[PDB]
Each structure stands twice: as C-alpha cells, then as structure tokens.
Amino acid sequence: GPEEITADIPNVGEAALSKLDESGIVYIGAEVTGGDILVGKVTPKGETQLTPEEKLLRAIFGEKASDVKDSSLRVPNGVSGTVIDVQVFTRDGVEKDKRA
Amino acid sequence: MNKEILAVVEAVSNEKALPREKIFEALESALATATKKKYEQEIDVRVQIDRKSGDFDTFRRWLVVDEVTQPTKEITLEAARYEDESLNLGDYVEDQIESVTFDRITTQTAKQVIVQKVREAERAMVVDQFREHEGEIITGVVKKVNRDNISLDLGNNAEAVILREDMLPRENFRPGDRVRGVLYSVRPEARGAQLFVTRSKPEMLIELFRIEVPEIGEEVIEIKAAARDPGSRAKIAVKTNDKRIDPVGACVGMRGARVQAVSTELGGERIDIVLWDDNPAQFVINAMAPADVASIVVDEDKHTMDIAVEAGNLAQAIGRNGQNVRLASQLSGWELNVMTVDDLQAKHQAEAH
C-alpha cells in the first residue's frame, strides 16, 4: 500500500496535532520551536484493503489505525520559527488534496 | 462534502440501533457546536442536513425573550411587523447559510459529539428494551467488581449497575458468575449506568418465590408483608386465599426444600414464612415467631404495640441485634415494645390495673 498524508496520527494526543489542518499539513503561519509533527505521513505495514467504511469507523470508533508506522515528518530538534509557505506536487493520477 | 455525510451514515456499524434520522440529528448538533465554536459570539443554529434530497444549510435561532444580552440570540416578543414574523414566541431566522463542516476543529468536535451521542443512544436503547421487564428475575454475568458498585452484562452489550446498598454486606461477586437479581430502577436520562438490579430488597424475594413457588403467580398464596435484614433474616407473611393449603407445607416446601433454596440464593438468610392475618395481634404474634407470646397491647393514638414476652425466651423473641423484633417493626410498621420479662407480664391486665 502507498503512503498517506492524512491527519489520523495515533499514539499521540491533540496538542501535537493541534497545528495540523484538516488535510494533514501544518497551517500557513503556525509557529514551531521543538520537534513537532507538521505533516501527517503514514505508511501501511501489514495488510492492504482497509475498507473505507472501517476507515471512517476507526476515525470515529473502534481501535486506532494499525498500519500507519507513525512515519510522519517533524521538524528537527533545534530549529525554530514560523512556517510561511507550503508547496505540494501530485503526480498525474493521485487524488489532489484540498490544500493543493 | 455531503457525499462524506452519506458515506458516514451508510458506514455505521449499528445501523438501526441508531436510525438515519437520529444520525442526522446528532450530525446537526455537531455542526451547530462547530458553528458556535467558530464565532466568538454565542448564537444557536439549526442545520437540517436534508438527509436524502440535498445538503445542509445553517440557520440562526433567536430564542425570543425580552433580554438583550448577546443580541445575536435576542429579540423582543413583539418584533413581528417587519421581516414577516407575525409572531409572539418561537421567532427564528435563517440569516447565515453555508458554513464549513469539514475543517480540522469541526471534524474533531463532530467525531467527539458523535461518539458521545452514539454511546448514549445505545445505552438508552439497551436499557429501555429491558425496562419493560421491570420487577422480574433476570440472569446475566457480572462484569467488574468494586468497593462501591459492580457491573453486570445481560447479553448484547447490556450494562447493568448494582450499587453497594443492593449488595448484601457479605454478598460476593467475581467476573464470570451469573448473579441473578431483580430490576427495580430505571433512569433513561442517566449520563452513566442506569440499569439498577437489586437482591437485598423484599421484592426480590417475591420474584424468587415466583420462579420457585408454583403457588405464587396464580394468586392463590398472596405475598402480603415482607421485611429483610441483608444476609441475616427475612420475615415474610404470606396469606392463603383458600383453606386446605398451609404455607408451612407449601411456601416452606418439604422439610426445607424451598426456603433452603431461596436462602442459598440470598446467601444463607433465615427466612421465616408465616401467615398474614387481618388482625394485628395474630400478625405480630406470627411476626415474632417462633416464640411464646402471652400479651398484646395496642395503641392507635400513638400506633404502638407492646408485647411482653415470657421470662427466659428473650433470645427466642429478641435474639441477636433484636432482629426478631426489628424486622417485626419493619413488617407491620408500628413501634413494637419488648421490655418486661417477669413483672407486668401482660401490660394490659397489669398496667391498666
């Protein structure tokens, strides 16, 4: 299965995810000073064919999303500042997110 | 978009345990809370997502009162000439339309409130479907034990709570056994556990007879009076409508065949099965049974009953904690007095003498 840039990051609270948008990208103008997940990158580790009904269920009910690996990119420990711009490039064929 | 709304209404697990109408009601509440959190001002809104024909459209409720605080949701009871109200109360407007229901905080609050609403609705439904059987013995496993209350499962996610007062002082539970009690209280508005099952109450006893004694249930041996001391002693006065049936041979059983069973059910409770009578004297004599009562004094002005027991049978008429009298005071409901032993042996032919 391919990777996802959704905002469903398990094994973490909302404070670390408060800076993320609905699509899964840090807002334009959201500051950051320490290691903080600014993009919701997840990758499947086991079985594919996660039904969308069960996907929304896990998003609302049930257990956490298993095959994520929490491989999201965060800013390195030591760099600070406020993000001012975000670019995104989608290959012809993949569903363009609403931020794009 | 609304296609996501259709996907989430058709992708629910409990599809009919939470109908589409209540689905969309909870979703409207979600969107209203989201729009409330959007603006810094407080303004109640309705959504009306148009379950099947179209999309949502937010509104603006006025909550018509003569106040002015946060006039976003304030309007006088007489503003009815312009904007076409012609109203007295209930004047609501449809000013703001097409809010956003798919951003981060909106999705978060929607998920939270949908979880809350679905768990509340499931609990309410699973308690109401059993509420019709109030006052009956039900089976079921206990779920978790604690020093204040215990949890029970009746099957198909049927949560029941049994408080410490419903449990006997030495009543004992472990998750796995089928502790059977009687449903006595229901509270479909409770934010938490609302299925109340008891075993320390005399109605439980009644239901026990109903599941054990074939006489009761046909109204041939009516259960009239019942007092309890949890795990200690249950005094029950049952009357016989007919004449050729004796409760000592019918309600008690065959040399402790039914009373012993109900006692093991109640965890070793001495059950005194006596006959109900329309005379207070015989009633209180059977209440303190077994004993040798040789006195009766009644007072309807103070509702008191004096019973001067015989000298020597104290432990036979009072016993531990005075239970034989206390339950008697809890059987008929009058102040019973057991003081004299030798002198004033009658309290009627001697006190009045």
Place this chain on the structure above:
Amino acid sequence: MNLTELKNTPVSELITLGENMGLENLARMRKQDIIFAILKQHAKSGEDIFGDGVLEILQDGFGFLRSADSSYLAGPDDIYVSPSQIRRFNLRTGDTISGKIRPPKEGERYFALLKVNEVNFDKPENARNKILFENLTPLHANSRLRMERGNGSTEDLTARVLDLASPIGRGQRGLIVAPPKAGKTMLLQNIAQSIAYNHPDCVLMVLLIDERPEEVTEMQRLVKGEVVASTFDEPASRHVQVAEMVIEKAKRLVEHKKDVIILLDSITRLARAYNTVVPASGKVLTGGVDANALHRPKRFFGAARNVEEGGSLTIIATALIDTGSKMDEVIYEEFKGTGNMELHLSRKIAEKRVFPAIDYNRSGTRKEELLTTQEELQKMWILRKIIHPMGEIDAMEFLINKLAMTKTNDDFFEMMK
C-alpha cells in the same frame, strides 16, 4: 482426592468443603478458584491429586487438559503437560486423559500430570496403537437407531414420527432446515432422550453453540449424559475453541472404536463465528461472507462417517432459515446438499400450533434401503405415496391422529395395510 468429584458437585458443596478445610470466606471466587484452593489445602497435608481432562495443543508445543465446567477453556483447574509426554505417549488434541496430577509446585501456577492412567478410557498400550481418523474408510449405516421409545406418551410423537419420516443410522450426515421459534429445542431434547433410552451404549454429545444460558442449563439438566455448551458471553473465539475441542474428542473416541452422536445447534451461528475469526483473504462474495471461511464448517460436517471395523460418528446439525438475513440464506445455500439426511421444519405448520411440524415431501434420507429391512421399507414407500398427493397441514394432522390411536409403529403399519 479426585477432580471429578469436585466437578459434579454444585457451588454450595464447594463452600462447605472449603469450610471443612478451614479456609477464608470463599463465596467471592470462581468455582475453579475454589477447587484450586481446596486441592492446594488437601495436598498441603501430603496428598496427591487425581484428574481428568480433554487435551488441547497450541503451536507452543505443550498441552492443556481442560474440564467440562468451563466447556473446555483455560482456567486454574486445567492441567499443564510438557511436550515430552505428548511425544512419548503419542498424545493429540481431543484425547481425554485421566490420571495422577499434582498442584503447581514452586514457581508453577497450573497442575501437572504425573502418571497417565486412562487414555480415552483405555490403557496406553492400545491408545498408542490408534488408527488414524482420516486414514479410515467411510461407509453407510445398516445399524438402525430406533427413535421409538415404546411408552407412547404425549410428546413421544415427535420421535416416532421420525421412524416414518427420517430414519436415523449410525454415522448419518443429518441437517435440520428450520426457521426460528419452531420447536427445534424440544426436538433435540426428544432425540437425545430417545437415543439414550434405546441406545445407552453410545456416548451422547450435544453441541450448544451461541445460545442463551437458560437453554444451556435446561439442556445440561435434561440430557441423559455428559453435555457441552457455549453461550455468547465470549466472542467467536470460545465458539471455535469448543468446536475444535469437541470435534477432536469425537475423532479420538471413534478412533478408539466408539459410537459418537453429536447434536449441533445451530450451525449458522458456527458459520458466523468461523467467518468472524478468520481474516479476509481479499475476496468476499454476496452476503459479507469470505470464500474459504466456510472451510471449517464444511470439514465439521464432513467428519461424519461410518467406520468399517467398528464405531461411528453421527452428526445432526440444525440450520436457521427464514430469518431474513440473506447471509444466512447463502449459508444454507452452501449447505444445500452436503448431508444425506434432511429434516425440514416449516413455520407455516408451526403457526397452526400443532407439534411436530414435518415437511414429509421435503425431508428424507438418501440410500435408505441399507438402513431398515424390506417390509419396513415397503411400508415407508406406501406411506410416502399416501402422503404425497395431500398437502402438509392435513397430512400432519392425519399422521398425528393415526399415531395417536396407536402406540407402536407396527399398529400404524398394519392399519395402513
């Protein structure tokens, strides 16, 4: 002490036994916890234990001997045995073993077997020399299992009618096709009572899968022998566990030249369970059912056969139809013709509230001349020809009246001549 004598007694007996043992207030713990404490107290006086348990193996290598109190699940009373004993005495799942056991020693927490005494009620000599189940040769039934009691009471009808509707043989592959709330519970109660009265030699087995506890206790106090059950207090894990346990027990018995007759109810719930536990292989068909998920129920229905040299394994499973679940529909469809005996119950006759409610034209047995004699078969043919033109309710009332004036089937036979 023996474990079975702690098995057959109710909870109050354990209470008074612990009070005899000078134990703390034990009314709070499980029955198995009480048994464990009592066995520890007994062995503290320098005593050995005698136990009996059905054996089960995981991939972990070692084995567990379960009792019927928890319907063969893990518990503080089950015995732990090393893989060395399984390798030596040629043990396998379902092999009930009875013998000397000890309480858990220093650092241990479950019982351990010392010396085997009875392997499936047999010495280890012939237990190690056991013929394999699948290596056997199936046959058909000539030994007719007479369902008639002969007393002719009010309910015995539902049994004797089978003597003219669906003959029963040892190792028969039977399946019931019936809607809910029709009378299957009392039907299997009747069949169990009748087979126990007429054939007490064959070990009785009844499968209560995904049922209510009231039915559990009513059937555990009415069957004329040891029974197993399983309610819905646990997920499909317990159901599949008890299914494997009972199937391996029956296999080991019939390998020991036993006559096992299992009564399963209901099989659609077993199919649902096997569907729920088995992960999706990436292909699903109509009904939300996986393709190869039904392989386990298939196998369970295929285990029925007739051994050549001796012994048999009869399986009589009930299926649920008319429930509205299309899933269930498809399930029954998979079970269209897998068995050679069909017992069809219809809700239309049961709505007229006469019992039993037999679908004579729809029910029957394949290759039935090998079960009964020639005159009985000719009379069955005559009865079938007489019952074919008429309907079902009138035919049922006719059969009920004819078997109500008479008691044994010979009277009805000669009356039909």
Place this chain on the structure above:
RNA sequence: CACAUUCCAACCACACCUGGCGUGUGGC
C-alpha cells in the same frame, strides 16, 4: 517415575537514525 518450564487491573522488553563514498562550493 523423572528432566525442564508455565503460553497472561496500570506497566517494565518490543527504541531511533544515513559522512556507503565521491564531487562541487565556501569559511577558519
């Protein structure tokens, strides 16, 4: 008989990342 272990209310164990090598540029 004996060796050796024994699979589960919070949680301890199941953690976290590219100088392989080269080139280019710049600074001390």
